[PDB]
């Protein structure tokens, strides 16, 4: 989040975005939310409402059940 | 043939540029290293803030630029154009320093 390119490449005059990665990290929902903002900036910064509060199997199932469309 | 400019040709547009532009011309981190190394002798382990450093470099830059202009005036007075040690010492002495 604190990176310079986080703000550098988030304000381009481009109508479409494409992101390629090897494999996103399973834990540390911070970078998952960061990528969610990278694809397009609409999601709220509060990632603790969906998960991160309360178990691992349910947490990962909910994590996979919210990023399915993209 | 390569477009090798004669010495003193680029200087025209160069002085056109840097007379209008008003940015710095000295590396910052070596300068703060210098001011530290001169400060510890007077007072060790000084807790330097972000300020009190740019003012010193600006002041010394203005003083040395004035001295260099005076030295250029002395060199032109010496029926020449280049700088030398004697021009600098004469300009400094006539400045009261």
């Amino acid at each position: 989040f604190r990176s310079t390119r986080w703000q550098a490449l988030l304000n381009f005059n481009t109508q479409r975005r494409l992101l390629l990665t090897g494999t996103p990290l399973q834990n540390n929902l911070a970078e998952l939310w960061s990528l969610l903002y990278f694809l397009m900036p609409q999601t709220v910064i509060d990632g603790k409402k969906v998960s991160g509060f309360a178990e691992t199997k349910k947490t990962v199932a909910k994590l996979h059940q919210v990023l399915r469309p993209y | 043939k390569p477009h090798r400019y004669k010495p003193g040709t680029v200087a025209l547009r160069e002085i056109r540029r840097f007379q209008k532009s008003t940015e710095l011309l000295i590396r910052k981190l070596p300068f703060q290293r210098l001011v530290r190394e001169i400060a510890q002798d007077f007072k060790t382990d000084l807790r330097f803030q972000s300020s009190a450093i740019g003012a010193l470099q600006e002041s010394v830059e203005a003083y040395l630029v004035s001295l260099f202009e005076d030295t250029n005036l002395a060199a032109i007075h010496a029926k020449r154009v280049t700088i030398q040690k004697k021009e600098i010492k004469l300009a400094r002495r006539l400045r009261g320093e």
Binding site: - | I38, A55, L56, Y63, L64
Partner: protein, 82 residues
């Protein structure tokens, strides 16, 4: 940071500074002699600055401290803390 940083004002830096004075050629021994002149001026300013800092019961040196240090030079024109 504390060892041989007098070369911070480099030879290309001195050449660029002399460019602002209006000179075409800068001799080889110009760089170190103007380095010594800068060292002398900086030492003269900072001696007064640190003495004022000791007088003011202060451990840190502020910009206004060197402003007063240069004040008794006798010009005192515009600048921060003027």
């Amino acid at each position: 940071i504390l060892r041989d940083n007098i070369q911070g004002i480099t030879k290309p830096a001195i050449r660029r500074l002399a460019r602002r004075g209006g000179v075409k050629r800068i001799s080889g021994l110009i760089y170190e002699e103007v380095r010594a002149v800068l060292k002398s001026f900086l030492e003269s300013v900072i001696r007064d600055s640190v003495t004022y800092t000791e007088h003011a019961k202060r451990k840190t040196v502020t910009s206004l401290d060197v402003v007063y240090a240069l004040k008794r030079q006798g010009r005192t024109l515009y600048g921060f803390g003027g």
